[PDB]
A paper describes a structure:
Factor XI (FXI) has an important role in thrombin generation in the amplification phase of the coagulation process. Inhibition of activated FXI (FXIa) should decrease thrombin generation in the amplification phase, but not in the initiation phase, and thus yield an antithrombotic and profibrinolytic effect with minimal risk of bleeding (see reviews). To improve crystallisability, the quadruple mutant (Ser75Ala, Lys78Ala, Thr97Ala and Cys123Ser), first reported by Jin et al., was generated. The mutated residues in this construct (FXIa CD) are located at least 16 Å from the catalytic residue Ser195 and the alterations are therefore not anticipated to impact ligand binding in the active site.
The compounds are potent FXIa and plasma prekallikrein inhibitors and selective against e.g. thrombin and FXa as seen in Fig. 6. The crystal structures of 9–11 in complex with FXIa CD were not available in the public domain and were therefore solved by X-ray crystallography. Given our aim to target the prime side, it was exciting to note the S1-S1’-S2’ binding mode for all three compounds, as shown for compound 9 in Fig. 7. None of the designed linked compounds, 20–24, reached as high potency as compound 10. However, compound 20 with an IC50 of 330 nM, suggests feasibility of including reverse amides in expanded structures. The crystal structures of compounds 9–11 in complex with FXIa CD gave a clear handle on directed expansion of fragments towards the prime side and allowed linking exercises.
Author numbering: 16 to 37, 37A, 37B, 37C, 37D, 38 to 48, 51 to 59, 59A, ...
Write the structure that this text describes.
């Protein structure tokens, strides 16, 4: 997260850190708890991942330093990637992880609500991006979970900033014209969370951008409301 600040324990309890163990254990991507056995994340996180056995999901984490060999984690039973997905920049950048065991909800770990199709006209004014990603294009994975409040921009605006791409209706963009606050490397798969009528909604999944926090280059996110039917179908199995 560029231009953000350290979060406090318990303020983003749907946020998880997904680790891979191959070739060695490290943070791979963010994710969001959406059900007792279900993490929603980005499809692009699973490049080269041939088995769910190498994945570990850690919940209730503020600092990566909390994760040692003796720290509890959730195993992954199955990775479900959208069948139209090919790469992040062309969309369908969404995936589900079915956990091996169930998350017992607490103030440290609880699900975020999905957006409603009836809310497509809602102007979300209180949106936050979170994660352990770089704080500059060249930086490193953060110990402490970061947060930044970032304004949504219209898809029409976003398209003008990425004329070499197609910004689709299943994408949503966020950023300042002058830059300075954005997701960055290591934040992908995590949530863009918007508070509306005193409830947090999972509006976006951190997906891609050209550089981090650059002038006239908003961050691009998977537009979650455009996938609620897909999420339902896949979780009903
Ligand atoms: O995490 C991201 C974020 C990309 C991104 C998203 C938005 Cl909304 C706006 C700008 C973005 N960036 C553009 N250039 N950098 N960020 N991307 C992942 C892509 C990816 C994930 C998994 C597998 C392959 C590729 C990444 O680089 N992740 C990442 C994770 C860890 C490290 C890392 N560094 N040191 N140790 N681990 C570096 C990069």
């Amino acid at each position: 997260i560029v231009g953000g600040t350290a979060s406090v324990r318990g303020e983003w309890p749907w946020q998880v850190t997904l680790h891979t163990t191959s070739p060695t254990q490290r943070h791979l991507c963010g994710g969001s708890i959406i059900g007792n056995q279900w993490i929603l994340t980005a499809a692009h996180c699973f490049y080269g991942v041939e088995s769910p056995k190498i994945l570990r999901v850690y919940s209730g984490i503020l600092n990566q330093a909390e994760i040692a060999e003796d720290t509890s984690f959730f195993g992954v039973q199955e990775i479900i990637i959208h069948d139209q997905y090919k790469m992040a920049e062309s969309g369908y950048d969404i995936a589900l992880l079915k956990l091996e065991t169930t998350v017992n909800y607490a103030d440290s770990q609880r699900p975020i609500s999905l957006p409603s199709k009836g809310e497509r006209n809602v102007i979300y004014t209180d949106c936050w991006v979170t994660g352990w990603g770089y704080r500059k294009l060249r930086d490193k994975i953060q110990n402490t979970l970061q947060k930044a409040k970032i304004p949504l921009v219209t898809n029409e605006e976003c398209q003008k900033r990425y004329r070499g791409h197609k910004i689709t209706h299943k994408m949503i963009c966020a950023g300042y014209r002058e830059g300075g606050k954005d997701a960055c490397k290591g934040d992908s798969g995590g949530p863009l969370s918007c508070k509306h009528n005193e409830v947090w909604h999972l509006v976006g999944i951190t997906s891609w951008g050209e550089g981090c926090a650059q002038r006239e280059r908003p961050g691009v996110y998977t537009n979650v409301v455009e996938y609620v039917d897909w999420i339902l179908e896949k979780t009903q199995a």
